[PDB]
Design a protein around this ligand. Structure first.
Ligand code: HEM
Ligand code: HEM
Ligand SMILES: NNC(=O)c1ccncc1
Ligand SMILES: [Cl-]
Ligand SMILES: [Cl-]
Ligand code: NA
Ligand code: NA
Lengths: 714, 713
């Protein structure tokens, strides 16, 4: 009820997304290092306790079949299942299921119970196992307990301490069907990027069918699209759904109107739980979670091949659960499926609409039949897919901790070869920077190429960055933002330098192209500082390696293309989201604060890093010199700015007294003179005492970006 | 995009505790603004500001060729958002340059005033904060026009994001009272903590209450709002008449000409707003308030013409060119200069709220005294201007520069100078042992030191343990302080003090303020020992004891804790939920969410609750410093339900037997409910956390004890 700045100005940009996750909200000390904690955990001990928990039923949420394994597999699947390849946001890697909004999503109903069941284990091991690792490890132990051998497990997901700022959609009603005022669909059922779910508060798709219509073929279209938006192909998708639905059951014993407030809405006495139900005992046999009432197999607590036997072995009739939801029952079947609580009851086989998709979509049916005929193929596929699902956002294999990490390198990990030769030392770095500057490559070309290589990193899923030298490979070499023709010329010169240096060495010392691109960028920044009269050495850390084309999945790389990069004043097309919002989004992915974003952008503009050598925001008469000119000129009140008649998103800056044109700029350039918080930062850097501070802060942020993916040095 | 606040609009907001991280600050971690300021050539800055006064810019031409009135309004408004209820607002953080205050309707065209000052800010850089520059500029404006100010102190460090302040619940700018989110109830009772009559005003409406042009009624709103800003009748009259000696209002055409406020304006406006389509949009055509008044015959020179005109004319109700109600002198000649045309003159004019100074009977007495004795007027105005502009700066030890007034003012809650050697580490150890041998308990010691130190609030830097004001009126008799228990503790400590000071040589002595804090430190050490942990709690001497004569009792009243969740105390029944009031108190204390959480769970097991209430005392070893609050709060074997007698008190029963185990309030149980607070509770309730909990508790306790220690900056 107190009115806030977001109430008064709801379309203004939000910078607090860049300053979340401060050391203020973190209870652990500054020096806490979770990897080091984890590495001394007795992982086998934790696994024993998790095995014991499986069948330790608690009366406040009694275990179906006497075994929590299905509930825990669903919990871990949902932890990972929020992931979107568009921006890398979501996934299991930050344990965000325990914070709002995900703790209270309708699709996460009763997973508050699942997490609560794990607190005694959490408490016993304390800081040595994060919630984020614990949720995945529990799902793995559930599978092992029920007879499925997993492909492996890595720890190293540090806990976080507040909610992430993620765009989950614009709907203001949970579960709203398509076509409303804030619809996430347009056109021929085109889901808006970056979303990867069909309704607000769902993980991927609606189990009754698209917008509730129980058509398995149409549902399969939604399955395919959302799963692809979560990095899964058809084979992985079938394996995951059929694999998962080998276990456990759904819950829909009575009408959904019996279920009360989600956790964030519940009373303080609920002590963090939600969805309290007035139906009968509210739990156990009477539980209501989705509103469906399906049990897939004849042994829901044991790995089996019964899913596909049932799917293909019966014909299916449409029916309704006790809550009124659409679901399917096997025609003419006997009552062969066990009841979760009463040994004297058995049930006919049942399926969701979206399970039927696996049989009635023609591409899925071929895979399903293969898995039915070849169950060893199904098991192997499901094990690989479960590992990928649960590790997709963990980043390079260098982050993976503990004794159960799979040795097999997987293409989806964007793998980087091991380095098996001496690295360049400081004298060698100095020799190579001189050679780069004697080649004729310009500051603009050197800065632009390193920026292009390093700025693909995003902290949301720890993909991208300059390691691997993938800028030389498809598809990065051909991205428009990367200036393919310019890039090719710089890479040819750098590869000739490299060849010359490597051919002159002894021992096995060599420099990778990945390291040379970054070092060359560093030489450009040093040259730019010299051009401005400043003596600056830029730090450089060797050790990057070059990945091959065959180690580079081109379709998976596509999502890393910068379609909006304000740091290079680039926008690939016209978007509904304003460019300055896209700039803050990119800064968040790069892990930048607002001051770092500000310094970086103003430096890049005067170094010539704009795509196409655009003059928009180039507020200097000494381009390729590292100065604070961007800020001093942007803040000059002798210039008046107006949008152009040709293009409302480009602005002309004229002398206020004469009308003479002095500059042009975009929304990304001018926001720094408009937003009250951004302008306060620009004033610091545009003050007469600030040139050396600007240069030193620029070098620090430049080095930060160059090192974002260097978990080999963590 | 839909946010958590959208889905759950009533859920508690912890992000207010985590502002001002080193993430959002452009200056290095090691920047110290006092060190930069102390080397500023303040005289040179003032010479540049003096020259700016009469250097008109054509994008916002100077009225009368002089920006001094604009800048005095700018500085008044920077200071004028201050509220004594919570200390929030004021000029001390330079928040006029951030949302929402940069876009309040009462701050219209002060974007232009701040813009005029950027060349000077640019020249001097980090050596002068925006916060200090806005105030300095108002002083130089006054001095340039012939008024002697009382002084100036630097030291307001800049901030880098908006403050989270409750300004009201209205959703429309300037909404008149009586709407669905009215800030008035009863017989025109303004809701605490608010200190303005309408959302987006500084104090009152210049046309009269809700627009009704009755000076007598307006005076009641003036008196109420200004008292809520720490000003009495003399100060109020001096300030309004002082201010309105200078400059003019702006209302040349209809207000529908004036476009979006700065936070709403297009990107091309480059941080300015209120662009006007009326004629030239500026200068002679300017529209700010919509009133068109010029008070004196010399708007660029200090005078006593405000009161000569107020009392020398009778007044007629009239309307400005924008349609606002205002007053014009009956029968008068055209003696007031025009701001741009030297061939035009105007009749004297006044606002409804100016006329309050004559038609309220108490104001009229003061106004007539100042009219007859303009030297009294000048002195009252200079003192009130200093107070206004420094009220949120904190102890005088924060005051920087060569123009600091030597006079000590009662409103500063002054602390006497220390003129003797301080106790050393071995002395402190001796005194801690003497305190523990006296028979004072852990609960008594912790509760007394908490009581003394936790009056601090970082909003205006008032309060804290320095001064030993806990022994004086009114603190000694506040209910939350447990007056009879407190008196017993204080008598025991004063006997220890007397014994130790009587045994010394060389003039060494310990103040009661330091011994209160040290005794609390001994209690926390003892509690740790009771748990099996040997720890030393840090302690820094150098507090002094203030006298009763040096303590304004009425000004102290706003520091009374009516809600202190750290002592499970709520003085009465409020509309705002107790958990929200806990977060508000944590923000005032400058605590993060982790610090709040540790501190509360420790206080509960040390016996710090008012009245020895058992609510939240989730331990069987009270007075031992353990993490038992968290381990017991998180025990899923306990089921919690509100009591039938009181919905805000909960019983914790064994889930299997029904046996009563504990009771708690909303402040206790929020740590088990709120998803971010429960995550913190889980860290401190884990089996590996004993050592960490003790360490973190001692660190936040020491932070609280030192909040007012600017003598150690
Ligand atoms: C098209 C994709 C999917 C849909 C629409 C879907 C739908 C559902 C629904 C409606 C439930 C019932 C929740 C309740 O009422 O308790 C559920 C349960 C479950 N799902 Fe899925 N699912 C999908 C994919 C997955 C995947 C990929 C996994 C894991 C690999 C998985 C594993 C499980 C398990 C184990 C259960 C049983 C939970 C219990 O025993 O408590 N599902 N699924
Ligand atoms: C009851 C309290 C007060 C009310 C209702 C009030 C009202 C106003 C209004 C409506 C304006 C015209 C804004 C514009 O259209 O440009 C203004 C101007 C001004 N006020 Fe006040 N005021 C109050 C107190 C003060 C105080 C305490 C001071 C300072 C000590 C101050 C100093 C000024 C000055 C110098 C101007 C002239 C600005 C210029 O020349 O641009 N006022 N006042
Ligand atoms: N929403 N979460 C992210 O965007 C992110 C998380 C961690 N580092 C960079 C970005
Ligand atoms: Cl996320
Ligand atoms: Cl404030
Ligand atoms: Na992610
Ligand atoms: Na304040």
């Amino acid at each position: 009820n107190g009115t806030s700045n977001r109430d008064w100005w709801p379309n203004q940009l939000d910078l607090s997304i860049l300053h979340r996750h401060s050391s203020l909200s973190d209870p652990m000390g500054k020096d806490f290092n979770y990897a080091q904690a984890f590495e001394k955990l007795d992982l086998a001990a934790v696994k024993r306790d998790l095995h014991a928990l499986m069948t330790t039923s608690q009366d406040w949420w009694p275990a179906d079949f006497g075994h929590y394994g299905g509930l825990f597999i669903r919990m871990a699947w949902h932890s990972a299942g929020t992931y979107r390849t568009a921006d890398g946001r979501g996934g299991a890697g930050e344990g965000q299921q325990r914070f709002a909004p995900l703790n209270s999503w309708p699709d996460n109903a009763n997973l508050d119970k699942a997490r609560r069941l794990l607190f005694p284990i959490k408490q016993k091991y304390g800081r040595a196992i994060s919630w984020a690792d614990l949720l995945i490890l529990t799902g793995n132990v559930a599978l092992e307990s029920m007879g499925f051998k997993t492909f492996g497990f890595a720890g190293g997901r540090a806990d976080t301490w507040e909610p992430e700022d993620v765009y989950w959609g614009s709907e203001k009603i949970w579960l709203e069907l398509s076509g409303g005022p804030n619809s996430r669909y347009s056109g021929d059922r085109q889901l808006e990027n970056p979303l990867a779910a069909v309704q607000m508060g769902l993980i991927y798709v609606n189990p009754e069918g698209p917008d509730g219509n129980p058509d398995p073929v149409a549902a399969a279209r939604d399955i395919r699209d959302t799963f692809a938006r979560m990095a899964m192909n058809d084979e992985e998708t079938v394996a995951l759904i059929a694999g998962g639905h080998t276990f456990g059951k759904t819950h829909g014993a009575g009408p959904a109107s019996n279920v009360g407030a989600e956790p964030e809405a519940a009373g303080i006495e609920a002590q963090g739980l939600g969805w309290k139900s007035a139906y009968r005992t509210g739990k156990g046999a009477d539980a209501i979670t989705s509103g469906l009432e399906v049990t897939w197999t004849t042994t829901p607590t044991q790995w089996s091949h019964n899913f596909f036997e049932n799917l293909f072995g019966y014909e299916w009739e449409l029916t309704k659960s006790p809550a009124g939801a659409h679901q399917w029952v096997a025609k003419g079947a006997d009552a062969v499926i066990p009841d979760a609580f009463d040994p004297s009851k058995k049930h006919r086989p049942t399926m969701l609409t979206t399970d039927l998709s696996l049989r009635f979509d023609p591409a899925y049916e071929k895979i399903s039949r293969r898995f039915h005929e070849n169950p060893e193929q199904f098991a192997d596929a499901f094990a690989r897919a479960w590992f990928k699902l649960t590790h997709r956002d963990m980043g390079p294999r260098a982050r993976y901790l503990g004794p159960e990490v799979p040795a097999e390198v997987l293409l989806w990990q964007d793998p980087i070869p091991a380095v098996d030769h001496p690295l360049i030392d400081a004298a060698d770095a100095a020799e190579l920077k001189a050679k780069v500057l004697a080649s004729g490559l310009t500051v603009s070309q050197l800065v632009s190429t390193a920026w292009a290589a390093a700025s693909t990193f995003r902290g949301s899923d720890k993909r991208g960055g300059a390691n691997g030298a993938r800028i030389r490979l498809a598809p990065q070499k051909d991205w428009e933002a990367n200036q393919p023709e310019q890039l090719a010329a710089v890479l040819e010169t750098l590869e000739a330098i490299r060849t010359a240096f490597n051919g002159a060495q002894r021992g096995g010392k060599q420099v990778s192209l990945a390291d040379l691109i970054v070092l060359a960028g560093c030489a450009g920044v040093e040259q730019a500082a010299k051009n401005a009269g400043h003596a600056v050495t830029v730090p450089f850390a060797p050790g990057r390696a070059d990945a091959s084309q065959e180690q580079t999945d081109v379709e998976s790389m596509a999502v890393l293309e910068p379609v909006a990069d304000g740091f290079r004043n680039y926008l690939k097309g016209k978007y509904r989201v304003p460019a300055e919002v896209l700039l803050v989004d990119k800064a968040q992915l790069l892990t930048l604060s607002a001051p770092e974003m500000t310094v970086l952008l103003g430096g890049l503009r005067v170094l010539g890093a704009n795509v196409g050598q655009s003059r928009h925001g180039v507020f200097t008469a000494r381009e390729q010199a590292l100065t604070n000119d961007f800020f001093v000129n942007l803040l000059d009140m002798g210039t008046e700015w107006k949008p152009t008649a040709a293009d409302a998103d480009v602005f002309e800056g004229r002398d206020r007294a004469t009308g003479e044109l002095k500059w042009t700029g975009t929304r990304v350039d001018l926001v720094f003179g408009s937003h009250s918080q951004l302008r306060a930062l620009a004033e610091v850097y545009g003050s007469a005492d600030a040139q050396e501070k600007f240069v030193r802060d620029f070098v620090a942020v430049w080095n930060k970006v160059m090192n974002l993916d260097r978990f080999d040095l963590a």
